[PDB]
DNA sequence: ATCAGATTCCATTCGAATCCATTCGAAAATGATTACATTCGAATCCATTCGAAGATTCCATTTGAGCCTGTTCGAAAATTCCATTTGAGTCCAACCAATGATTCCATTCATTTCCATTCAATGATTCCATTCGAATCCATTTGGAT
DNA sequence: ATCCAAATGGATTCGAATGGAATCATTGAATGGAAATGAATGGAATCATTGGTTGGACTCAAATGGAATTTTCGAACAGGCTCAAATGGAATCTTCGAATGGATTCGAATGTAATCATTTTCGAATGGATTCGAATGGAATCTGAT
């Protein structure tokens, strides 16, 4: 398969207007998208991570949204719905 | 030609999304994301779709909340705009730093 | 033949959060009435989400409860967003919420 | 693949509360999530409990003061109530 | 001596200790009635107050740090309730 | 009693955290803040003291309350 | 009766610093880390073997709970240590 | 002749496997997982107390006491972060003051 | 800036006092040790599930023009808050005198644990039923310009 | 207050994915007769703390005095909103091979389990200490005016 490089830039500027919208927020200053960007990445750096423990504990090389769910517990926040 | 003035589309808009629950991320997008990060930790991985849809509520959770702490720290210091700085206090607070 | 739901006047399993009990490894052994008064308080905690979802169910005109009622449901009550602050909701949403210093002059 | 779920009994408990409306697969999804998170935070609150006393054993007392220590205010009430006549409707026989 | 600076000064006098900044036990005075308020003939361990008193000055400065945050962030030098609530809010403890 | 809490000892708990000046109002929602606090750990404490059917509350049970709230207490046994 | 950690902490103390020695409540605060470690690292070796649903927690559990639980490199340098210690001990 | 010796380590390991079966964490207990556990735990000590004993003493008192203990967590990244939300008794605060209130 | 007088830290020695040191007996603990149990680490053959790729629609993405208003600007007014002495007010800590409140036994009964051995409960199936995710519309805005 | 313009509701209808039944079969609650514990149970030393009353002593509470932070302005600057035409690529569909799970068989290798006997580890004093609270002298420092 072709190689994976930058598709944090796949979060555009919209999505992240849009997820300004539904927090709350009335005015987007420039800085903000890049530093959307950052934040989001660390994010989810640090769920997949261990979602990725999780499934090779498991000895699996699919990652299963229960392991997604154990890791987002792990990290203090829960997530309600894909408890399966 | 008609404009409606600054900042008016944009509280139309806040109302527009907190009515709706949507993904707000295009979904493939986000979801080679998460196969670059994924792989870029471990590879010949594999997901079921279930496990990016799962990842995907939890970052837009994780996003449109901070969003708001950082408004109101947009507001505390009589701003109108959220600039880095409040990301960066907010974050600082929350203890994620 | 007796069940245990029904001598407790439950709903919930007793027999089985007796069984999760044990397959849990909370503690060697389980009383008797532990796993009774606790499929109680689960019982009531359904019971009270589920009618104040309910709520707003119908006050968007519908019949059946998607998420985003329970969502609205938890997030207004208090004692209930309490218990669930660090929970989040599939497909939730968010409270039609505008911070008043951002309204027109 | 065939194991466990309680969306049988949020149903009925649905039925009872709200006998007019129904609930989606997903809504019910959340639920599931809601029974398990609670069951899992009551259960370890009352072994850490029974272990901090050096007891073998979880009974009643233990899920109760479990639920007084979890649960904020009025349905830390209302839920030590609905457990106390749960029980004391139980070892009635 | 100036204004603000014996401020700096005393900073660094506590922060170069670790005394315990509330006096003795018009703590354990506060402490007792709030725990009567729950239970009546209640009895302290002089451990367990000094726990007590302990983890909430710990708390305290917490809180004075970020609100010190807060206060900057809004161009001031100066803490006031607003900044409390604003660090309280963010913690998610309101 | 929660103003035998002073306005010195607050304007110390400021120091630490270092603070410049302090507002007037601010004694107060410190007061405030504090009372909220030792009210929720006192609370849990004594649920643990007669669980155990003591009626002393051992620093032991202040130390697994603090735990519960989520700010853990290193030194006095937990 | 009853435990305490204050023997090995004090052993492993002066074997690293032969110059330095600890204050008894410094040694309680590092009874209390211990306390709070064991916990952390039994408690998530215990959740590993239940979400996998076996009834043993092995040398191999204990280790996803360490790269869990620690950050880095310190989870690296801890994984070392351990994955050392059980080897030697095997080997008898 | 004690197991802890027979993995060279300081920190009981036979306590360790007591102390698991009597957690409750699962009924049945590993053979290698007391010993790497107890391997983790005096390997974390000692990171402790060296860090310690160093910041212990740029300013010349005998042996750790709590302050030390905390500069030595708080100012080492991978320890503060593993700590972050645990509270010291005795602990202080790192001699922080912000630039903007600088003279 | 390098005077210029005070507080003030910032240290080099002292005579002590609150610990920690190693010692020094008396439980509770670990380690073996044969003798059972069990868990799974080890082979399969099924069966879900996912990765992929091509194609066609049009929803959004982007990008740049244009300018309103929100940020930062320097300044000027008004006020809350630091520094500083003085009153006296309540602490530090000091033992110290009392019997409540722990907590550890050496008894028993009630209670939970086992373990087959069935009895319903519950969960997986289609199986064909209804709210509803789209689809326009105009009533009702609501907007910003006259 | 005025007519005007896109946008916002929320009430009509349309084929379709979704929910909620009835039905057959696999687990799992549940009976019920012994096996093993568990918690009070009344009965006792022991510890660990309420309780006053005691003095020197900071530590507090006020109240002068003014100095700079904060507020408020009013102005300059620029950044972000808004709009519109191209079009990029997501979203949808439906295909399809087979890597990767998974139910279920299966046994050597691993962990329990009484049952002992040996030693480690605790607790409690007993003998050098190690740093607390002064003692000041000296930069070091802060800040008032030739």
Same mark, same amino acid.
């Given at each position: 398969?072709?190689?994976?490089?930058?598709?944090?830039?796949?979060?555009?500027?919209?999505?992240?207007? $849009?997820?300004?919208?539904?927090?709350?927020?009335?005015?987007?200053?420039?800085?903000?998208?890049?530093?959307? $960007?950052?934040?989001?990445?660390?994010?989810?750096?640090?769920?997949?991570?261990?979602?990725?423990?999780?499934?090779?504990?498991?000895?699996?090389?699919?990652?299963?949204?229960?392991?997604?769910?154990?890791?987002?517990?792990?990290?203090? $926040?829960?997530?309600?719905?894909?408890?399966? | 030609?008609?404009?409606?003035?600054?900042? #008016?589309? @944009?509280?139309?808009?806040?109302?527009?999304?907190?009515?709706? #629950?949507?993904?707000?991320?295009?979904?493939?997008?986000?979801?080679?994301?998460?196969?670059?990060?994924?792989?870029?930790?471990?590879?010949?991985?594999?997901?079921?779709?279930?496990?990016?849809?799962?990842?995907?509520?939890?970052?837009?959770?994780?996003?449109?909340?901070?969003?708001?702490? #950082?408004?109101?720290? @947009?507001?505390?210091?009589?701003?109108?705009?959220?600039?880095?700085?409040?990301?960066?206090?907010?974050?600082?607070?929350?203890?994620?730093? | 033949?007796?069940?245990?739901?029904?001598?407790?006047?439950?709903?919930?399993?007793?027999?089985?959060?007796?069984?999760?009990?044990?397959?849990?490894?909370?503690?060697?052994?389980?009383?008797?009435?532990?796993?009774?008064?606790?499929?109680?308080?689960?019982?009531?905690?359904?019971?009270?989400?589920?009618? &104040?979802?309910?709520?707003?169910?119908?006050?968007?005109?519908?019949?059946?409860?998607?998420?985003?009622?329970?969502?609205?449901?938890?997030?207004?009550?208090?004692?209930?967003?309490? &218990?669930?602050?660090?929970?989040?909701?599939?497909?939730?949403?968010?409270?039609?919420?505008?911070?008043?210093?951002?309204?027109?002059? | 693949?065939?194991?466990?779920?309680?969306?049988?009994?949020?149903?009925?408990?649905?039925?009872?509360?709200?006998?007019?409306? +129904?609930?989606?697969?997903?809504?019910? +999804?959340?639920?599931?999530?809601?029974?398990?998170?609670?069951?899992?935070?009551?259960?370890?609150?009352?072994?850490? %409990?029974?272990?901090?006393?050096?007891?073998?054993?979880?009974?009643?007392?233990?899920?109760?003061?479990?639920?007084? %220590?979890?649960?904020? +205010?009025?349905?830390?009430?209302?839920?030590?109530?609905?457990?106390?006549?749960?029980?004391?409707?139980?070892?009635?026989?």
């Amino acid at each position: 398969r072709k190689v994976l490089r930058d598709n944090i830039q796949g979060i555009t500027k919209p999505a992240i207007r $849009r997820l300004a919208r539904r927090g709350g927020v009335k005015r987007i200053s420039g800085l903000i998208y890049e530093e959307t $960007r950052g934040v989001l990445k660390v994010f989810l750096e640090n769920v997949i991570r261990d979602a990725v423990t999780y499934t090779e504990h498991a000895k699996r090389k699919t990652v299963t949204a229960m392991d997604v769910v154990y890791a987002l517990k792990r990290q203090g $926040r829960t997530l309600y719905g894909f408890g399966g | 030609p008609h404009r409606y003035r600054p900042g #008016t589309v @944009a509280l139309r808009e806040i109302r527009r999304y907190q009515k709706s #629950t949507e993904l707000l991320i295009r979904k493939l997008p986000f979801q080679r994301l998460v196969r670059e990060i994924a792989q870029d930790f471990k590879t010949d991985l594999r997901f079921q779709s279930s496990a990016v849809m799962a990842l995907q509520e939890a970052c837009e959770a994780y996003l449109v909340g901070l969003f708001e702490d #950082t408004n109101l720290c @947009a507001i505390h210091a009589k701003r109108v705009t959220i600039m880095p700085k409040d990301i960066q206090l907010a974050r600082r607070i929350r203890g994620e730093r | 033949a007796k069940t245990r739901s029904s001598r407790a006047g439950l709903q919930f399993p007793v027999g089985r959060v007796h069984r999760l009990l044990r397959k849990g490894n909370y503690s060697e052994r389980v009383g008797a009435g532990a796993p009774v008064y606790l499929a109680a308080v689960l019982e009531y905690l359904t019971a009270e989400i589920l009618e &104040l979802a309910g709520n707003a169910a119908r006050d968007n005109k519908k019949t059946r409860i998607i998420p985003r009622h329970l969502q609205l449901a938890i997030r207004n009550d208090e004692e209930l967003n309490k &218990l669930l602050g660090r929970v989040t909701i599939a497909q939730g949403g968010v409270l039609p919420n505008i911070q008043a210093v951002l309204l027109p002059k | 693949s065939r194991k466990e779920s309680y969306s049988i009994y949020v149903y009925k408990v649905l039925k009872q509360v709200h006998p007019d409306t +129904g609930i989606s697969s997903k809504a019910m +999804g959340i639920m599931n999530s809601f029974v398990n998170d609670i069951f899992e935070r009551i259960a370890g609150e009352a072994s850490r %409990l029974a272990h901090y006393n050096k007891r073998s054993t979880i009974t009643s007392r233990e899920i109760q003061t479990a639920v007084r %220590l979890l649960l904020p +205010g009025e349905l830390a009430k209302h839920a030590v109530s609905e457990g106390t006549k749960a029980v004391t409707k139980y070892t009635s026989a």
